[PDB]
Amino acid sequence: GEKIRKKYPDRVPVIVEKAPKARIGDLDKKKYLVPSDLTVGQFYFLIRKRIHLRAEDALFFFVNNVIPPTSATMGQLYQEHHEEDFFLYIAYSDESVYGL
């Protein structure tokens, strides 16, 4: 990570975690290296299989307490959900109840 920065200072070291008591597939790693130009549609792909989900499972990414559509890019999120002073933080869950 620290070394991946000096060499790839233009990339985006995103972090991964689950909501409180989440219930999605297992996880092999919690840190993806994606370029800032990638769109939310591309990232949703590299995690999909990482969440052991497919067909029509349920899932929703929450970043910095937000849930924007796939009309954005991780690179732009860098300045938004950087969370820690080095990498960014993104978690996900399998719930979607209907607010009242």
Swiss-Prot record:
Tissue spec: Heart, brain, placenta, liver, skeletal muscle, kidney and pancreas.
Region (Interaction with LIR (LC3 nteracting Region) motif of ATG3): 31-33
Propiece span(s): 100
Region (Interaction with GPHN), start-end ranges: 19-100
Domain of life: Eukaryota
Sample GO molecular function, one term: beta-tubulin binding
Zinc-finger recorded as keyword: no
Gene Ontology CC terms: actin cytoskeleton; autophagosome; autophagosome membrane; axoneme; cytoplasmic vesicle; cytosol; GABA-ergic synapse; Golgi membrane
The keyword Cytoplasm is assigned to this record: yes
GO process terms (BP): autophagosome assembly; autophagosome maturation; cellular response to nitrogen starvation; chemical synaptic transmission; extrinsic apoptotic signaling pathway via death domain receptors; microtubule cytoskeleton organization; mitophagy; positive regulation of proteasomal ubiquitin-dependent protein catabolic process
Site-annotated residues for Cleavage: 99-100
Region (Interaction with GABRG2): 19-51
Coiled coil feature spans: none
InterPro entries attached to this UniProt entry: Atg8-like (IPR004241), Ubiquitin-like_domsf (IPR029071)
Residue numbers marked as site, Interaction with LIR (LC3 nteracting Region) motif of ATG3: 11
Function: Ubiquitin-like modifier that plays a role in intracellular transport of GABA(A) receptors and its interaction with the cytoskeleton. Involved in autophagy: while LC3s are involved in elongation of the phagophore membrane, the GABARAP/GATE-16 subfamily is essential for a later stage in autophagosome maturation. Through its interaction with the reticulophagy receptor TEX264, participates in the remodeling of subdomains of the endoplasmic reticulum into autophagosomes upon nutrient stress, which then fuse with lysosomes for endoplasmic reticulum turnover.
PANTHER family given in the database record: MICROTUBULE-ASSOCIATED PROTEINS 1A/1B LIGHT CHAIN 3-RELATED
The protein's assembly and partners: Interacts with GPHN and NSF. Interacts with ATG7, ATG13. Interacts with ATG3. Interacts with alpha- and beta-tubulin. Interacts with GABRG2. Interacts with RB1CC1. Interacts with ULK1. Interacts with CALR. Interacts with DDX47. Interacts with TP53INP1 and TP53INP2. Interacts with TBC1D5 and TBC1D25. Directly interacts with SQSTM1. Interacts with MAPK15. Interacts with TECPR2. Interacts with PCM1. Interacts with TRIM5 and TRIM21. Interacts with MEFV. Interacts with KIF21B. Interacts with WDFY3; this interaction is required for WDFY3 recruitment to MAP1LC3B-positive p62/SQSTM1 bodies.
Record-given protein name: Gamma-aminobutyric acid receptor-associated protein
Organism: Homo sapiens
Source taxonomy: Eukaryota, Metazoa, Chordata, Craniata, Vertebrata
Gene that this sequence comes from: GABARAP
